[PDB]
Design an enzyme around this catalytic site. Structure first.
Site, PDB file in Angstrom:
ATOM      1  CB  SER A 196      -0.966  -0.008   1.198  1.00 16.76           C
ATOM      2  OG  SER A 196      -2.058   0.891   1.002  1.00 16.76           O
ATOM      3  CD  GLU A 323      -5.462  -4.220  -3.928  1.00 13.77           C
ATOM      4  OE1 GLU A 323      -5.646  -3.829  -2.747  1.00 13.77           O
ATOM      5  OE2 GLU A 323      -4.406  -4.768  -4.282  1.00 13.77           O
ATOM      6  CG  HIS A 436      -5.808  -2.341   0.331  1.00 11.02           C
ATOM      7  ND1 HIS A 436      -4.986  -2.197  -0.769  1.00 11.02           N
ATOM      8  CD2 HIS A 436      -5.337  -1.484   1.269  1.00 11.02           C
ATOM      9  CE1 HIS A 436      -4.031  -1.327  -0.489  1.00 11.02           C
ATOM     10  NE2 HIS A 436      -4.225  -0.874   0.737  1.00 11.02           N
TER      11      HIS A 436
HETATM   12  O1  8IV Z   1      -5.303   2.924   5.430  1.00 16.51           O
HETATM   13  C1  8IV Z   1      -5.812   4.071   5.491  1.00 16.51           C
HETATM   14  N1  8IV Z   1      -5.777   4.706   6.735  1.00 16.51           N
HETATM   15  C2  8IV Z   1      -5.228   4.200   7.970  1.00 16.51           C
HETATM   16  C3  8IV Z   1      -6.442   3.622   8.897  1.00 16.51           C
HETATM   17  O2  8IV Z   1      -6.201   3.939  10.230  1.00 16.51           O
HETATM   18  C4  8IV Z   1      -6.629   2.058   8.745  1.00 16.51           C
HETATM   19  N2  8IV Z   1      -7.148   1.600   7.413  1.00 16.51           N
HETATM   20  C5  8IV Z   1      -8.400   0.732   7.451  1.00 16.51           C
HETATM   21  C6  8IV Z   1      -8.112  -0.810   7.231  1.00 16.51           C
HETATM   22  C7  8IV Z   1      -9.417  -1.625   6.827  1.00 16.51           C
HETATM   23  C8  8IV Z   1      -9.282  -2.907   5.923  1.00 16.51           C
HETATM   24  C9  8IV Z   1      -7.938  -2.996   5.089  1.00 16.51           C
HETATM   25  C10 8IV Z   1      -7.252  -1.657   4.915  1.00 16.51           C
HETATM   26  C11 8IV Z   1      -6.899  -1.024   6.252  1.00 16.51           C
HETATM   27  C12 8IV Z   1      -6.509   4.598   4.206  1.00 16.51           C
HETATM   28  C13 8IV Z   1      -5.732   4.479   2.863  1.00 16.51           C
HETATM   29  C14 8IV Z   1      -5.457   5.606   2.087  1.00 16.51           C
HETATM   30  C15 8IV Z   1      -4.752   5.534   0.856  1.00 16.51           C
HETATM   31  C16 8IV Z   1      -4.299   4.312   0.363  1.00 16.51           C
HETATM   32  C17 8IV Z   1      -4.547   3.156   1.123  1.00 16.51           C
HETATM   33  C18 8IV Z   1      -5.249   3.241   2.338  1.00 16.51           C
HETATM   34  C19 8IV Z   1      -7.867   3.887   4.211  1.00 16.51           C
HETATM   35  C20 8IV Z   1      -8.004   2.488   4.138  1.00 16.51           C
HETATM   36  C21 8IV Z   1      -9.243   1.817   4.179  1.00 16.51           C
HETATM   37  C22 8IV Z   1     -10.423   2.529   4.319  1.00 16.51           C
HETATM   38  C23 8IV Z   1     -10.317   3.913   4.421  1.00 16.51           C
HETATM   39  C24 8IV Z   1      -9.063   4.567   4.381  1.00 16.51           C
END
Ligand code: 8IV
Ligand SMILES: *[C@@H]1O[C@H](CO[C@@H]2O[C@@H](C)[C@@H](O)[C@@H](O)[C@@H]2O)[C@@H](O[C@@H]2O[C@H](CO)[C@@H](O)[C@H](O)[C@H]2NC(C)=O)[C@H](O)[C@H]1NC(C)=O
Ligand SMILES: *[C@@H]1O[C@H](CO[C@@H]2O[C@@H](C)[C@@H](O)[C@@H](O)[C@@H]2O)[C@@H](O[C@@H]2O[C@H](CO)[C@@H](O)[C@H](O)[C@H]2NC(C)=O)[C@H](O)[C@H]1NC(C)=O
Ligand SMILES: *[C@@H]1O[C@H](CO[C@@H]2O[C@@H](C)[C@@H](O)[C@@H](O)[C@@H]2O)[C@@H](O[C@@H]2O[C@H](CO)[C@@H](O)[C@H](O)[C@H]2NC(C)=O)[C@H](O)[C@H]1NC(C)=O
Ligand SMILES: *[C@@H]1O[C@H](CO[C@@H]2O[C@@H](C)[C@@H](O)[C@@H](O)[C@@H]2O)[C@@H](O)[C@H](O)[C@H]1NC(C)=O
Ligand code: NAG
Ligand code: NAG
Ligand code: CL
Ligand code: CL
Ligand code: CL
Ligand code: CL
Ligand code: CL
Ligand code: CL
Ligand code: CL
Ligand code: CL
Ligand code: CL
Ligand code: CL
Ligand code: CL
Ligand code: CL
Ligand code: CL
Ligand code: NA
Ligand code: NA
Length: 527
Positions: A196, A323, A436
């Site tokens: 990621s 994803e 993802h």
């Molecule tokens: O990972 C993000 N943020 C940190 C957040 O504390 C934790 N993630 C949520 C999890 C839920 C299932 C699998 C993925 C992780 C954000 C993001 C932004 C840009 C590229 C990739 C990921 C994101 C991820 C999922 C939903 C909403 C935002």
């Protein structure tokens, strides 16, 4: 008792029993002066020598960050939240070495994701002890600053130049060059891998001239710098810096007087204000991320990629089947991890406004047009699956594919995988599929642990993936040459072959998501 003489002092590790064998673990070696006080927002500074035996026997502090509180008590979200104390004093790294000590082992360096706002190397699914035990590689992972504390940008101003968390990564890669041979490691055989925002990080080290000499090969899981979320423009970055200044009461005229004012603010004040620096954000909102700083990144990375300005080496790149699904339950109307999330045409349209807030009506219509011409119009999952595909294709799959085609056009071997296995222990609901971030545990060999309630077929799949990753790092070639495995062909720009990773039949396919990616890569950036 196991003490190693690093260049800055002696560190003591601990012994780990793994599969009837032993791994030596060094958890929490510091690799920089803690970026505190007047060092907050600066690039990381080199560490002064210590004369004691540093005790590297516990994971160190995680870097300050906002926590995912959207599903309290739910393992599917909370497995990703930090499992050590949050602290600005967080520039530490870990080392797993085989037992007995290797002589010249290939090194795998892990860079976690988290949207450049979160993450930590101490997570259970990043435990490198299984790779060390099983493939006799050395696994290294580091903490790096995230969020505003890692990526606040006043371009040109060293008080806050941007990309600090990427320089945190880079300094740790330097630690490995200066020190890993003392651990049995081969500094000439270093493979970066990451997922990621970690994967985007790896791709940016492929472009940064300052990182060229610090690694050999690169593995990119579900991410690359050309994904729409990975690089903040100089416009948004300064508008975001300036907003944060206003929210904290730190609006000054002398641009350095602003940074000075954000340095007497407690970390919590900075963290709680990061959410609002963007007016209408998306679930994938990377409030503070990599920018074109003119130091780590000398030009816009699309231009560097397109004109061949990157480290010439082999890459391994891949994506997961679904994803986009994880993001739908963080804002899309009608979605929920606790029901089947059958959404209407109207809800789908509202969902595009959520993920494309500043895009024109015609642009949103063009997405609807490309993804709402189905074989069966009665299928009630149609709009639910379309929105997941939209988000995944736009944000992950098509940029990774485009990075791979462009990178390989300059003559290097590239290997592309499509991970389509849904973990039998996945706590999210079934409609979300192969989410993802849920290949990571397979890459790290967690199903190799027979006690952990994965199926036999998953132990086999992990066992093969671990072999292929290790063979890639060691030999530039991700084959499993013994157990009559399917041969992984190189990704060429003409035929675009890729390998599917699953528990049944691993197949060679061509031109993943070809139709969808012509829309995203050729037509959509015109809108
Ligand atoms: O990972 C993000 N943020 C940190 C957040 O504390 C934790 N993630 C949520 C999890 C839920 C299932 C699998 C993925 C992780 C954000 C993001 C932004 C840009 C590229 C990739 C990921 C994101 C991820 C999922 C939903 C909403 C935002
Ligand atoms: C550890 O091995 C290196 C050789 O590394 C090889 O090449 C890398 C690119 C990587 O792909 C590894 O898998 C390979 O094993 C040894 O480096 C040699 O060092 C001598 C000096 O003594 C030098 O004259 C040679 O040119 C180097 N060889 C190469 C191929 O560059 C190194 O000595 C080994 N370390 C120990 C402690 O044995
Ligand atoms: C550049 O930044 C402005 C300022 O952001 C606003 O104020 C911050 C403190 C923060 O709370 C943001 O959420 C605010 O949006 C933004 O434009 C603003 O837009 C909102 C309504 O959408 C409103 O406050 C004003 O119209 C704008 N603020 C001004 C003009 O000071 C937006 O992020 C960027 N705007 C432009 C024109 O580039
Ligand atoms: C799936 O659930 C969403 C979310 O609703 C919440 O979660 C449910 C599991 C349940 O606990 C509800 O009581 C909660 O409100 C539903 O979306 C809601 O739909 C209603 C009416 O259609 C609407 O008033 C709300 O604004 C919606 N909320 C959100 C966040 O979208 C959805 O209807 C459920 N779908 C199915 C097929 O059951
Ligand atoms: C570092 O930790 C040491 C741990 O105590 C013991 O040390 C070795 C000999 C092993 O037997 C280990 O399993 C034990 O726990 C302390 O003795 C030492 O004082 C500590 N030093 C500092 C600076 O914290
Ligand atoms: C801002 O403050 C710094 C530190 O005192 C100073 O060096 C710099 O010249 C100031 N900038 C302006 C435009 O006055
Ligand atoms: C190949 O199969 C054998 C069967 O005993 C197994 O022990 C071994 O781990 C397998 N290797 C890989 C790389 O999957
Ligand atoms: Cl610590
Ligand atoms: Cl804190
Ligand atoms: Cl844990
Ligand atoms: Cl888990
Ligand atoms: Cl598919
Ligand atoms: Cl319809
Ligand atoms: Cl179209
Ligand atoms: Cl899991
Ligand atoms: Cl269903
Ligand atoms: Cl074939
Ligand atoms: Cl397809
Ligand atoms: Cl084509
Ligand atoms: Cl088209
Ligand atoms: Na497909
Ligand atoms: Na069109």
């Amino acid at each position: 008792d196991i003490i190693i003489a690093t260049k800055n002092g002696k560190v003591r590790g601990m012994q780990l029993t793994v599969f009837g064998g032993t791994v030596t673990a060094f958890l929490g070696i510091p690799y920089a002066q803690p970026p505190l006080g007047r060092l907050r927002f600066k690039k990381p500074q080199s560490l002064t020598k210590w004369s004691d035996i540093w005790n590297a026997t516990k994971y160190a502090n995680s870097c300050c960050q906002n926590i995912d509180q959207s599903f309290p008590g739910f393992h599917g979200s909370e497995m990703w939240n930090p499992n050590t104390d949050l602290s600005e004093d967080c520039l530490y790294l870990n080392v797993w070495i085989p037992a007995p000590k290797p002589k010249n082992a290939t090194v795998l360096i892990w860079i976690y994701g988290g949207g450049f706002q979160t993450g930590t190397s101490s997570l259970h699914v990043y435990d490198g002890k299984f790779l060390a035990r099983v493939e006799r590689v050395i696994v290294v992972s580091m903490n790096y600053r995230v969020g505003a504390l890692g990526f606040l940008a006043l371009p040109g101003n060293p008080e806050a130049p941007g990309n600090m968390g990427l320089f945190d990564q880079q300094l740790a890669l330097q630690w490995v060059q200066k020190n890993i041979a003392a651990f049995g490691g081969n500094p000439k055989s270093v493979t970066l891998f990451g997922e990621s925002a970690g994967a985007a990080s790896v791709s940016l080290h492929l472009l940064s001239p300052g990182s060229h000499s610090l690694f050999t090969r690169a593995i990119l899981q579900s991410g690359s710098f050309n994904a729409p979320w990975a690089v903040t423009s100089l416009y948004e970055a300064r508008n975001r810096t300036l907003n944060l200044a206003k929210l904290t009461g730190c609006s000054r005229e002398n641009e350095t007087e602003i940074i000075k004012c954000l340095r007497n603010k407690d970390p919590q004040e900075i963290l709680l204000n990061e959410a609002f620096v963007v007016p209408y954000g998306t679930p994938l909102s990377v409030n503070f991320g990599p920018t074109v700083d003119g130091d780590f990144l000398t030009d816009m990375p699309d231009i560097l990629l397109e004109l061949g300005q990157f480290k010439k080496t082999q890459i391994l790149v891949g994506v997961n089947k679904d994803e986009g699904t994880a993001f739908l339950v963080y804002g899309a109307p009608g979605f929920s991890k606790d029901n089947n999330s059958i959404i209407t045409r109207k809800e789908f349209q509202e969902g595009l406004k959520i993920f494309f807030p500043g895009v024109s009506e015609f642009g949103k219509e063009s997405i609807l047009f490309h993804y709402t011409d189905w074989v069966d119009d009665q299928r009630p999952e149609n709009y639910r699956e379309a929105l997941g595909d939209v988000v995944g294709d736009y944000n992950f799959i098509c940029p990774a594919l485009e990075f791979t085609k462009k990178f390989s056009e300059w003559g290097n071997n590239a290997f592309f995988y499509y991970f389509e296995h849904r973990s039998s222990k996945l706590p999210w609901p079934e409609w979300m599929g192969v989410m993802h971030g849920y290949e990571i545990e397979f890459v790290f060999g967690l199903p190799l642990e027979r006690r952990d309630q994965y199926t036999k077929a998953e132990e086999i799949l992990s066992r093969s993936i671990v072999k292929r990753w290790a063979n890639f790092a060691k030999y530039g070639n991700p084959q499993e040459t013994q157990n009559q495995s399917t041969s992984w062909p190189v990704f060429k720009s003409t035929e675009q072959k890729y390998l599917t990773l699953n528990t049944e039949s691993t197949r060679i396919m061509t031109k993943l998501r070809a139709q969808q990616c012509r829309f995203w890569t050729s037509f959509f950036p015109k809108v």
